[PDB]
Amino acid sequence: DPYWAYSGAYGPEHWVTSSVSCGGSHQSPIDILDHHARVGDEYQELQLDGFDNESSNKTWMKNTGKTVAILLKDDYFVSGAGLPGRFKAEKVEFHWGHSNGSAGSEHSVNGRRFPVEMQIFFYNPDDFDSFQTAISENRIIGAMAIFFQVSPRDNSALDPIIHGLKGVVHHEKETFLDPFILRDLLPASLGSYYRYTGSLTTPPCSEIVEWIVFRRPVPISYHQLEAFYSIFTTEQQDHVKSVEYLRNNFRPQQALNDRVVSKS
Amino acid sequence: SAYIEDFETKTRSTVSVREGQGVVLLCGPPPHFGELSYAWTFNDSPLYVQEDKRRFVSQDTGNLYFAKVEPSDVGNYTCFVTNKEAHRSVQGPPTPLVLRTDGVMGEYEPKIEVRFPETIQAAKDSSIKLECFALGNPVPDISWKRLDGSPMPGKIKYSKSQAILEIPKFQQEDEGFYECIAGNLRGRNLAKGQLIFYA
């Protein structure tokens, strides 16, 4: 586990030095040009399981200093959508901008970036015993990308998440979360999504991820977004440590190269 | 057996920070053997911070902490390291501190940057020193509490704006859970630990 940052000396263009996979040709994130997407006519329809159930109070949130992570304590499954088997949810991470809903997503569609991108990571439990096992076996995991877009009104479905962020302002803080409905953190219409093969968007940047990217965004008000802009981290140099806003925590987009993006 | 080398670095990177921002300057003392003590200079004069809750020098870590930086902090800092056993002192490189002009840092809850261990074995009649200091805007206040809510024995010594709680002549009734609270208008955080008596 090498040190890495989103900017400066250990920023994205330096990642390859300590994690050579970060210089790969199947990296994530990407811009999705819809008119170049192939229509996946062979897809079995996306099936979600457990997404409608209230999350347990053992579910918790952490400020890792690079993102805010949610460690899921319930069984959630996704299958179909050209995914190789049935995948189980492990955790959630977020990426956001700077202020006033400025671009913060990792992916984009037709060049449009979004104020927040939420990512849910999955493993196939039929092949591996845990998410950690799947990572260390270095073969294949699943990931969902969800965009948020500014809305004039608060999205009440987000309340436990926003309240969570209020409670993890500093690097390494942790809090338990009020119950939430994971389905309600997904777009209202799951109809349009994209599929492509890619990688982790942080070191070690392993090219093992089957990505689902939903086209339609989830609403979030400017008032709720402020909870994201109120997250801090620390930056530690040779002889200074400082408390800083955690902002623009996204990786630059990567070339498609030989890859084609598919769409529902 | 006791020694300390000269610092190797001639000059340190300029520190650029926002007015209102919390910053820690790291001493980084050179190789040595023996217990070290610490002071910091500011523009070629010693820093007099022991009645100022905004700035703290830790004799444990050696570092200089700015709970929040003000325009008056702008200048050159060095860390001055004394090795008492070695009868030798060495001065660190000049460290420029400058304010950014991008705007000021907002208010935010305290973050504890120096604390005491979660478990401490405390020998009878020994002296136990606990430190706690936080960065934050407004400048945080540090207070201390026994979890059992009992008043502190008179022997306890508070110093440096309560950044330091010392427990002399440690007795069995002194053992138990302690916590320091770092608080301001935007919120509060704590550090807790258990002191465990042995003889």
Side-chain angles (χ1 to χ4, degrees):
Chain A
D1 279 85
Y3 173 73
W4 63 267
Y6 275 112
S7 67
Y10 293 86
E13 328 286 347
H14 180 76
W15 290 1
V16 59
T17 300
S18 287
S19 310
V20 65
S21 291
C22 291
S25 288
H26 287 171
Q27 294 288 288
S28 295
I30 62 177
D31 176 48
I32 290 150
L33 300 179
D34 183 89
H35 67 275
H36 282 160
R38 174 202 68 91
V39 174
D41 281 328
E42 73 286 12
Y43 287 171
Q44 302 292 321
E45 52 191 342
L46 188 69
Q47 307 263 141
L48 303 180
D49 298 307
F51 275 69
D52 286 334
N53 298 332
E54 260 189 9
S55 64
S56 163
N57 55 42
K58 305 306 184 55
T59 294
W60 60 284
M61 174 184 277
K62 176 168 188 78
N63 176 340
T64 70
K66 303 287 173 48
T67 188
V68 163
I70 296 176
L71 296 318
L72 297 169
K73 294 293 160 171
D74 297 275
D75 290 350
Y76 304 104
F77 302 99
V78 60
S79 52
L83 294 177
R86 196 191 203 227
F87 285 72
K88 175 171 174 175
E90 169 77 11
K91 67 180 184 166
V92 187
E93 298 182 352
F94 296 85
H95 308 269
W96 60 88
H98 178 272
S99 59
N100 303 323
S102 71
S105 62
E106 304 212 282
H107 299 87
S108 59
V109 179
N110 297 336
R112 181 174 300 259
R113 288 184 65 224
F114 292 87
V116 185
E117 179 175 325
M118 179 184 72
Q119 305 171 333
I120 307 170
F121 301 83
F122 296 78
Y123 68 106
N124 185 335
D126 300 280
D127 313 316
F128 324 92
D129 200 283
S130 75
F131 185 82
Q132 285 66 36
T133 297
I135 286 299
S136 90
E137 289 300 309
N138 203 33
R139 289 175 36 217
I140 178 154
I141 61 156
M144 273 173 43
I146 292 86
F147 304 122
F148 298 3
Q149 179 63 279
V150 167
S151 171
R153 293 186 304 178
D154 276 10
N155 179 357
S156 65
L158 303 189
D159 280 7
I161 308 316
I162 304 308
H163 180 54
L165 298 165
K166 298 306 221 71
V168 289
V169 160
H170 289 301
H171 191 174
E172 297 196 308
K173 291 197 75 185
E174 304 175 350
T175 186
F176 283 109
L177 294 182
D178 297 332
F180 62 89
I181 298 182
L182 193 59
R183 175 58 181 94
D184 290 346
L185 309 187
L186 264 61
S189 180
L190 303 179
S192 320
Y193 55 89
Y194 302 101
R195 286 265 12 249
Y196 82 101
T197 189
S199 79
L200 301 173
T201 63
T202 64
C205 306
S206 314
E207 295 179 340
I208 60 180
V209 184
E210 287 309 307
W211 280 94
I212 312 180
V213 179
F214 291 105
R215 184 169 197 177
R216 266 81 241 204
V218 164
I220 185 169
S221 69
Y222 280 122
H223 176 62
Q224 281 167 320
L225 277 168
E226 285 300 317
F228 282 105
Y229 307 144
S230 299
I231 301 300
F232 284 71
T233 182
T234 59
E235 181 170 345
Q236 155 82 223
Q237 309 225 17
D238 276 344
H239 297 86
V240 183
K241 176 176 177 180
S242 65
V243 167
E244 309 273 357
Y245 291 106
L246 171 49
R247 282 170 193 176
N248 292 334
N249 59 333
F250 51 82
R251 181 194 196 186
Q253 291 180 339
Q254 308 292 308
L256 267 299
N257 297 308
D258 66 312
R259 296 177 287 179
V260 333
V261 189
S262 294
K263 69 178 155 177
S264 53
Chain B
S1 293
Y3 77 94
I4 180 163
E5 295 174 359
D6 291 11
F7 284 81
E8 194 72 20
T9 309
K10 193 189 186 73
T11 64
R12 296 252 201 254
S13 298
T14 302
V15 188
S16 292
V17 286
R18 277 186 202 97
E19 180 168 0
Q21 183 164 23
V23 181
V24 187
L25 302 188
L26 271 39
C27 186
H32 66 279
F33 187 70
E35 195 171 296
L36 307 184
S37 55
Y38 300 90
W40 281 77
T41 67
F42 168 75
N43 295 347
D44 295 327
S45 302
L47 221 39
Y48 303 98
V49 299
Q50 288 193 147
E51 301 202 9
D52 176 6
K53 76 179 187 178
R54 181 174 71 76
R55 289 172 296 164
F56 174 69
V57 172
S58 168
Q59 294 300 323
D60 281 352
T61 69
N63 302 331
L64 170 59
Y65 305 74
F66 299 83
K68 96 178 181 175
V69 166
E70 304 199 334
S72 63
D73 296 325
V74 170
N76 278 27
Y77 296 81
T78 79
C79 184
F80 200 88
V81 185
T82 303
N83 184 331
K84 296 198 213 167
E85 284 162 86
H87 304 300
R88 168 102 171 301
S89 286
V90 290
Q91 182 178 22
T95 313
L97 192 159
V98 178
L99 281 193
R100 294 160 45 106
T101 52
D102 294 306
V104 305
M105 176 96 18
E107 291 187 343
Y108 60 96
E109 71 178 48
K111 184 187 186 301
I112 299 173
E113 281 296 327
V114 48
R115 54 158 301 163
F116 56 95
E118 290 184 307
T119 49
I120 297 169
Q121 299 280 339
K124 185 183 168 288
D125 300 335
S126 77
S127 191
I128 297 306
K129 194 175 184 201
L130 313 184
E131 291 187 351
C132 180
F133 195 83
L135 317 186
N137 184 10
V139 179
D141 298 293
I142 309 298
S143 42
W144 297 82
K145 181 193 316 297
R146 292 189 170 183
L147 284 204
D148 66 15
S150 66
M152 298 288 181
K155 65 181 182 183
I156 272 59
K157 298 193 289 190
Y158 295 95
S159 56
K160 285 100 149 303
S161 301
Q162 293 195 63
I164 299 176
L165 186 158
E166 180 173 306
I167 308 172
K169 322 135 52 164
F170 199 86
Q171 303 303 320
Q172 176 152 80
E173 74 255 18
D174 297 322
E175 79 174 333
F177 285 86
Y178 289 66
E179 59 180 14
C180 74
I181 305 161
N184 66 16
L185 281 163
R186 297 299 179 167
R188 56 208 316 110
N189 288 303
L190 58 93
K192 44 149 46 186
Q194 174 187 10
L195 306 189
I196 308 167
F197 178 88
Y198 72 99

Coordinates of all heavy atoms in Angstrom, one line a residue, chain A residues 79-142:
Chain A
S79 N -27.5 -8.8 -10.1 CA -27.2 -9.9 -11.1 C -27.7 -9.4 -12.5 O -28.4 -8.4 -12.6 CB -27.8 -11.2 -10.7 OG -29.2 -11.1 -10.4
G80 N -27.4 -10.2 -13.5 CA -27.7 -9.8 -14.9 C -26.9 -8.7 -15.4 O -25.7 -8.5 -14.9
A81 N -27.4 -7.9 -16.3 CA -26.7 -6.7 -16.9 C -25.4 -7.1 -17.4 O -24.4 -6.3 -17.4 CB -26.6 -5.6 -15.8
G82 N -25.2 -8.3 -17.9 CA -24.0 -8.8 -18.5 C -22.9 -9.0 -17.5 O -21.8 -9.2 -17.8
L83 N -23.3 -9.0 -16.2 CA -22.4 -9.3 -15.1 C -22.2 -10.8 -15.1 O -23.1 -11.6 -15.2 CB -22.9 -8.8 -13.8 CG -23.0 -7.3 -13.5 CD1 -23.5 -7.0 -12.1 CD2 -21.6 -6.6 -13.7
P84 N -20.9 -11.2 -14.8 CA -20.6 -12.7 -14.7 C -21.0 -13.2 -13.4 O -20.2 -13.3 -12.5 CB -19.1 -12.7 -14.9 CG -18.6 -11.3 -14.5 CD -19.7 -10.4 -14.8
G85 N -22.3 -13.6 -13.3 CA -22.8 -14.2 -12.1 C -23.4 -13.2 -11.2 O -23.7 -12.0 -11.6
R86 N -23.6 -13.6 -9.9 CA -24.3 -12.8 -8.9 C -23.3 -12.1 -8.0 O -22.4 -12.7 -7.5 CB -25.3 -13.6 -8.1 CG -26.3 -12.9 -7.3 CD -27.0 -13.9 -6.3 NE -28.3 -13.5 -5.9 CZ -28.7 -13.5 -4.6 NH1 -27.9 -13.9 -3.7 NH2 -30.0 -13.1 -4.3
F87 N -23.5 -10.8 -7.8 CA -22.5 -10.0 -7.0 C -23.1 -9.4 -5.8 O -24.3 -9.1 -5.8 CB -21.9 -8.9 -7.9 CG -20.9 -9.3 -8.9 CD1 -21.3 -10.1 -10.0 CD2 -19.5 -9.1 -8.7 CE1 -20.3 -10.5 -10.9 CE2 -18.6 -9.5 -9.6 CZ -19.0 -10.2 -10.7
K88 N -22.3 -9.3 -4.7 CA -22.8 -8.9 -3.4 C -22.1 -7.6 -3.0 O -20.9 -7.4 -3.2 CB -22.5 -10.0 -2.4 CG -22.8 -9.6 -0.9 CD -22.7 -10.8 0.0 CE -22.8 -10.5 1.4 NZ -22.8 -11.7 2.3
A89 N -22.8 -6.7 -2.4 CA -22.3 -5.4 -2.1 C -21.4 -5.4 -0.8 O -21.7 -6.1 0.1 CB -23.4 -4.4 -1.9
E90 N -20.3 -4.7 -0.9 CA -19.4 -4.6 0.3 C -19.4 -3.2 0.9 O -19.6 -3.0 2.1 CB -18.0 -5.0 -0.2 CG -16.9 -4.7 0.9 CD -16.9 -5.7 2.0 OE1 -17.6 -6.7 1.9 OE2 -16.3 -5.4 3.1
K91 N -19.1 -2.2 0.0 CA -18.9 -0.9 0.6 C -19.3 0.2 -0.5 O -19.5 -0.1 -1.6 CB -17.5 -0.7 1.0 CG -16.5 -0.7 -0.2 CD -15.1 -0.5 0.3 CE -14.1 -0.4 -0.9 NZ -12.7 0.1 -0.5
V92 N -19.4 1.4 0.0 CA -19.7 2.6 -0.8 C -18.7 3.7 -0.6 O -18.2 3.9 0.5 CB -21.1 3.2 -0.5 CG1 -21.5 4.2 -1.5 CG2 -22.2 2.1 -0.4
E93 N -18.2 4.3 -1.7 CA -17.3 5.5 -1.6 C -17.9 6.6 -2.5 O -18.6 6.4 -3.4 CB -15.9 5.1 -2.0 CG -15.3 4.0 -1.1 CD -13.9 3.6 -1.4 OE1 -13.4 4.1 -2.5 OE2 -13.3 2.8 -0.7
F94 N -17.4 7.8 -2.2 CA -18.0 9.0 -2.8 C -16.8 9.9 -3.4 O -15.7 9.9 -2.9 CB -18.8 9.9 -1.9 CG -20.0 9.2 -1.3 CD1 -20.0 8.4 -0.2 CD2 -21.3 9.4 -1.9 CE1 -21.1 7.8 0.3 CE2 -22.4 8.8 -1.4 CZ -22.3 8.0 -0.3
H95 N -17.2 10.6 -4.5 CA -16.3 11.6 -5.0 C -17.0 12.9 -5.3 O -18.1 12.8 -5.8 CB -15.6 11.1 -6.3 CG -15.0 9.7 -6.2 ND1 -13.7 9.5 -5.9 CD2 -15.6 8.5 -6.3 CE1 -13.4 8.3 -5.7 NE2 -14.5 7.6 -6.0
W96 N -16.4 14.0 -5.0 CA -17.2 15.3 -5.1 C -16.2 16.4 -5.5 O -15.0 16.2 -5.6 CB -17.9 15.6 -3.8 CG -17.0 15.7 -2.6 CD1 -16.4 16.9 -2.2 CD2 -16.6 14.7 -1.6 NE1 -15.7 16.7 -1.0 CE2 -15.8 15.3 -0.7 CE3 -16.9 13.4 -1.5 CZ2 -15.2 14.6 0.4 CZ3 -16.3 12.7 -0.4 CH2 -15.5 13.3 0.5
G97 N -16.8 17.6 -5.8 CA -16.1 18.7 -6.3 C -15.6 19.7 -5.2 O -15.1 19.2 -4.2
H98 N -15.9 20.9 -5.4 CA -15.3 22.0 -4.6 C -16.3 22.9 -4.0 O -16.3 23.2 -2.8 CB -14.3 22.9 -5.5 CG -13.7 24.0 -4.8 ND1 -14.3 25.2 -4.6 CD2 -12.5 24.1 -4.1 CE1 -13.5 26.0 -3.9 NE2 -12.5 25.4 -3.6
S99 N -17.3 23.3 -4.8 CA -18.3 24.3 -4.3 C -19.4 24.5 -5.3 O -19.1 24.3 -6.5 CB -17.6 25.6 -4.0 OG -17.0 26.2 -5.2
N100 N -20.6 24.9 -4.9 CA -21.6 25.2 -5.8 C -21.9 24.2 -6.8 O -22.3 24.5 -8.0 CB -21.4 26.6 -6.4 CG -21.1 27.7 -5.4 OD1 -21.8 27.7 -4.3 ND2 -20.2 28.6 -5.7
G101 N -21.7 22.9 -6.5 CA -22.0 21.8 -7.4 C -21.0 21.7 -8.5 O -21.3 21.1 -9.5
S102 N -19.8 22.2 -8.4 CA -18.8 22.1 -9.4 C -18.5 20.6 -9.6 O -18.7 19.8 -8.7 CB -17.5 22.8 -9.0 OG -16.8 22.2 -7.9
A103 N -18.0 20.3 -10.8 CA -17.8 18.9 -11.2 C -16.9 18.1 -10.2 O -15.9 18.6 -9.8 CB -17.1 18.9 -12.6
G104 N -17.4 16.9 -9.9 CA -16.7 16.1 -8.9 C -16.8 14.6 -9.2 O -16.2 13.8 -8.5
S105 N -17.5 14.2 -10.3 CA -17.6 12.8 -10.6 C -16.4 12.3 -11.3 O -15.5 13.1 -11.8 CB -18.8 12.6 -11.5 OG -18.7 13.3 -12.8
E106 N -16.2 11.0 -11.3 CA -15.0 10.4 -12.0 C -15.4 10.2 -13.4 O -14.7 10.6 -14.4 CB -14.6 9.2 -11.3 CG -14.3 9.4 -9.8 CD -13.2 8.5 -9.3 OE1 -13.5 7.3 -9.0 OE2 -12.1 8.9 -9.1
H107 N -16.5 9.4 -13.6 CA -17.1 9.2 -15.0 C -17.8 10.4 -15.5 O -18.2 11.4 -14.8 CB -18.0 8.0 -15.0 CG -17.3 6.7 -14.6 ND1 -17.2 6.3 -13.3 CD2 -16.7 5.8 -15.4 CE1 -16.6 5.2 -13.3 NE2 -16.3 4.8 -14.6
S108 N -18.1 10.4 -16.8 CA -19.0 11.4 -17.4 C -19.7 10.7 -18.5 O -19.4 9.6 -19.0 CB -18.2 12.6 -17.9 OG -17.2 12.2 -18.8
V109 N -20.8 11.3 -19.0 CA -21.6 10.9 -20.1 C -21.7 12.0 -21.1 O -22.0 13.1 -20.8 CB -23.0 10.4 -19.8 CG1 -23.8 9.9 -21.0 CG2 -22.9 9.3 -18.7
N110 N -21.3 11.7 -22.4 CA -21.2 12.8 -23.4 C -20.5 14.0 -22.9 O -20.8 15.1 -23.3 CB -22.6 13.1 -24.0 CG -23.2 11.9 -24.7 OD1 -22.5 11.0 -25.1 ND2 -24.6 11.9 -24.7
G111 N -19.5 13.8 -22.0 CA -18.7 15.0 -21.5 C -19.3 15.7 -20.4 O -18.7 16.7 -19.9
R112 N -20.5 15.3 -19.9 CA -21.1 15.9 -18.7 C -20.7 15.3 -17.4 O -20.9 14.1 -17.2 CB -22.6 15.9 -18.8 CG -23.3 16.7 -17.7 CD -24.8 16.8 -17.9 NE -25.2 17.5 -19.1 CZ -25.6 18.8 -19.2 NH1 -25.7 19.5 -18.0 NH2 -25.9 19.4 -20.3
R113 N -20.0 16.1 -16.6 CA -19.7 15.6 -15.3 C -20.7 16.1 -14.3 O -21.6 16.9 -14.6 CB -18.3 16.1 -14.9 CG -17.1 15.4 -15.7 CD -15.7 15.8 -15.3 NE -15.5 15.4 -13.9 CZ -14.9 16.2 -13.0 NH1 -14.5 17.4 -13.3 NH2 -14.7 15.7 -11.8
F114 N -20.7 15.5 -13.1 CA -21.8 15.6 -12.1 C -21.2 16.0 -10.8 O -20.0 15.8 -10.6 CB -22.6 14.4 -12.0 CG -23.5 14.1 -13.2 CD1 -22.9 13.3 -14.3 CD2 -24.8 14.5 -13.3 CE1 -23.7 13.1 -15.4 CE2 -25.5 14.3 -14.5 CZ -25.0 13.5 -15.5
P115 N -22.0 16.7 -9.9 CA -21.4 17.2 -8.6 C -20.9 16.1 -7.7 O -20.0 16.4 -6.9 CB -22.6 17.9 -8.0 CG -23.8 17.6 -8.9 CD -23.3 17.3 -10.3
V116 N -21.5 14.9 -7.8 CA -21.0 13.8 -6.9 C -21.1 12.5 -7.7 O -22.1 12.4 -8.5 CB -21.8 13.7 -5.6 CG1 -21.2 12.6 -4.7 CG2 -21.9 15.0 -4.8
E117 N -20.2 11.6 -7.5 CA -20.3 10.2 -8.0 C -20.2 9.3 -6.8 O -19.2 9.3 -6.1 CB -19.3 9.9 -9.0 CG -19.4 8.5 -9.5 CD -18.5 8.2 -10.7 OE1 -18.2 9.1 -11.5 OE2 -18.0 7.0 -10.8
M118 N -21.2 8.5 -6.6 CA -21.3 7.4 -5.6 C -20.9 6.1 -6.3 O -21.5 5.8 -7.3 CB -22.6 7.4 -4.9 CG -22.7 6.3 -3.8 SD -24.3 6.2 -3.1 CE -25.2 5.4 -4.4
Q119 N -20.0 5.3 -5.7 CA -19.6 4.1 -6.2 C -19.9 2.9 -5.2 O -19.5 3.0 -4.1 CB -18.1 4.1 -6.6 CG -17.8 5.3 -7.6 CD -16.3 5.5 -7.8 OE1 -15.5 5.2 -7.0 NE2 -16.0 6.0 -9.0
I120 N -20.5 1.9 -5.7 CA -20.7 0.7 -4.8 C -19.9 -0.5 -5.3 O -20.0 -0.9 -6.5 CB -22.2 0.3 -4.7 CG1 -23.0 1.5 -4.3 CG2 -22.3 -0.8 -3.7 CD1 -24.5 1.2 -4.4
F121 N -19.1 -1.1 -4.5 CA -18.2 -2.1 -4.9 C -18.8 -3.5 -4.5 O -19.3 -3.7 -3.4 CB -16.8 -1.9 -4.3 CG -16.2 -0.6 -4.7 CD1 -16.6 0.6 -4.0 CD2 -15.4 -0.5 -5.8 CE1 -16.0 1.8 -4.4 CE2 -14.8 0.7 -6.2 CZ -15.2 1.9 -5.5
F122 N -18.6 -4.5 -5.4 CA -19.2 -5.8 -5.3 C -18.2 -6.9 -5.4 O -17.2 -6.7 -6.1 CB -20.3 -6.0 -6.3 CG -21.5 -5.1 -6.1 CD1 -21.4 -3.8 -6.6 CD2 -22.7 -5.6 -5.6 CE1 -22.5 -3.0 -6.5 CE2 -23.8 -4.8 -5.5 CZ -23.7 -3.5 -5.9
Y123 N -18.4 -8.1 -4.8 CA -17.7 -9.3 -5.1 C -18.6 -10.4 -5.3 O -19.7 -10.4 -4.9 CB -16.7 -9.6 -4.0 CG -17.3 -10.0 -2.7 CD1 -17.3 -11.4 -2.3 CD2 -17.9 -9.1 -1.8 CE1 -17.9 -11.8 -1.1 CE2 -18.5 -9.5 -0.6 CZ -18.5 -10.9 -0.3 OH -19.1 -11.3 0.9
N124 N -18.2 -11.4 -6.1 CA -19.0 -12.6 -6.4 C -18.7 -13.6 -5.2 O -17.6 -14.2 -5.2 CB -18.7 -13.2 -7.7 CG -19.5 -14.4 -8.1 OD1 -20.1 -15.1 -7.2 ND2 -19.7 -14.7 -9.4
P125 N -19.6 -13.8 -4.3 CA -19.4 -14.7 -3.2 C -19.4 -16.2 -3.5 O -19.0 -17.0 -2.7 CB -20.6 -14.3 -2.2 CG -21.7 -14.0 -3.1 CD -21.0 -13.3 -4.3
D126 N -19.8 -16.5 -4.7 CA -19.7 -17.9 -5.2 C -18.3 -18.4 -5.5 O -18.0 -19.6 -5.7 CB -20.6 -18.2 -6.4 CG -22.1 -17.8 -6.1 OD1 -22.8 -18.7 -5.5 OD2 -22.5 -16.7 -6.5
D127 N -17.4 -17.4 -5.7 CA -16.1 -17.7 -6.1 C -15.1 -17.3 -5.1 O -14.0 -17.9 -5.0 CB -15.7 -17.0 -7.4 CG -16.8 -17.1 -8.5 OD1 -17.4 -18.2 -8.7 OD2 -17.2 -16.1 -9.1
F128 N -15.4 -16.4 -4.2 CA -14.6 -15.9 -3.1 C -15.4 -15.8 -1.8 O -16.6 -15.6 -1.9 CB -13.9 -14.6 -3.5 CG -13.6 -14.4 -5.0 CD1 -14.5 -13.9 -5.9 CD2 -12.4 -14.9 -5.5 CE1 -14.2 -13.8 -7.2 CE2 -12.1 -14.8 -6.8 CZ -13.0 -14.2 -7.7
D129 N -14.7 -15.8 -0.7 CA -15.4 -15.8 0.6 C -15.6 -14.4 1.1 O -16.5 -14.2 1.9 CB -14.6 -16.6 1.6 CG -15.4 -17.1 2.8 OD1 -15.7 -16.2 3.7 OD2 -15.8 -18.3 2.8
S130 N -14.9 -13.5 0.6 CA -15.0 -12.1 1.1 C -14.5 -11.1 0.0 O -13.9 -11.5 -1.0 CB -14.1 -11.9 2.3 OG -12.8 -11.8 2.0
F131 N -14.8 -9.8 0.1 CA -14.4 -8.8 -0.8 C -12.8 -8.7 -0.8 O -12.2 -8.5 -1.8 CB -15.0 -7.5 -0.5 CG -14.6 -6.4 -1.5 CD1 -15.3 -6.3 -2.6 CD2 -13.6 -5.5 -1.2 CE1 -15.0 -5.3 -3.6 CE2 -13.3 -4.5 -2.1 CZ -14.0 -4.4 -3.3
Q132 N -12.3 -8.9 0.4 CA -10.8 -8.8 0.6 C -10.1 -10.0 -0.1 O -9.1 -9.8 -0.8 CB -10.5 -8.8 2.1 CG -10.7 -7.5 2.8 CD -12.2 -7.2 2.9 OE1 -13.1 -8.0 3.0 NE2 -12.5 -5.9 2.7
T133 N -10.7 -11.2 -0.1 CA -10.2 -12.3 -0.8 C -10.2 -12.0 -2.3 O -9.2 -12.3 -3.0 CB -11.1 -13.6 -0.5 OG1 -11.0 -13.9 0.9 CG2 -10.6 -14.8 -1.4
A134 N -11.3 -11.5 -2.8 CA -11.4 -11.2 -4.3 C -10.4 -10.2 -4.7 O -9.8 -10.3 -5.8 CB -12.8 -10.7 -4.6
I135 N -10.1 -9.2 -3.9 CA -9.1 -8.2 -4.2 C -7.7 -8.9 -4.3 O -7.0 -8.6 -5.2 CB -9.1 -7.1 -3.2 CG1 -10.3 -6.1 -3.4 CG2 -7.8 -6.2 -3.3 CD1 -10.3 -5.5 -4.8
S136 N -7.4 -9.7 -3.3 CA -6.1 -10.3 -3.2 C -5.9 -11.4 -4.3 O -4.8 -11.6 -4.7 CB -5.9 -10.9 -1.8 OG -6.3 -12.2 -1.7
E137 N -7.0 -12.1 -4.7 CA -6.9 -13.0 -5.8 C -6.8 -12.3 -7.1 O -6.4 -12.9 -8.1 CB -8.2 -13.9 -5.8 CG -8.2 -14.9 -4.7 CD -7.0 -15.9 -4.6 OE1 -6.8 -16.5 -5.7 OE2 -6.4 -16.0 -3.6
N138 N -7.1 -11.0 -7.1 CA -6.8 -10.1 -8.3 C -7.5 -10.6 -9.6 O -6.9 -10.5 -10.7 CB -5.3 -10.0 -8.5 CG -5.0 -8.7 -9.2 OD1 -5.6 -7.7 -9.1 ND2 -3.9 -8.8 -10.0
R139 N -8.7 -11.1 -9.5 CA -9.3 -11.6 -10.8 C -10.5 -10.7 -11.2 O -10.4 -10.1 -12.3 CB -9.8 -13.0 -10.6 CG -8.7 -14.1 -10.5 CD -9.2 -15.4 -10.2 NE -10.5 -15.6 -10.9 CZ -11.5 -16.3 -10.3 NH1 -11.4 -16.9 -9.1 NH2 -12.6 -16.4 -11.0
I140 N -11.6 -10.6 -10.5 CA -12.7 -9.8 -10.9 C -13.7 -9.3 -9.8 O -14.1 -10.1 -9.0 CB -13.6 -10.5 -12.0 CG1 -14.8 -9.7 -12.4 CG2 -14.0 -11.9 -11.4 CD1 -15.3 -10.1 -13.8
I141 N -14.0 -8.0 -9.8 CA -15.0 -7.5 -8.9 C -16.0 -6.7 -9.7 O -15.8 -6.4 -10.9 CB -14.4 -6.6 -7.8 CG1 -13.6 -5.4 -8.3 CG2 -13.5 -7.5 -6.8 CD1 -13.5 -4.3 -7.3
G142 N -17.1 -6.2 -9.1 CA -18.1 -5.4 -9.7 C -18.2 -4.1 -9.1 O -17.9 -3.9 -7.9

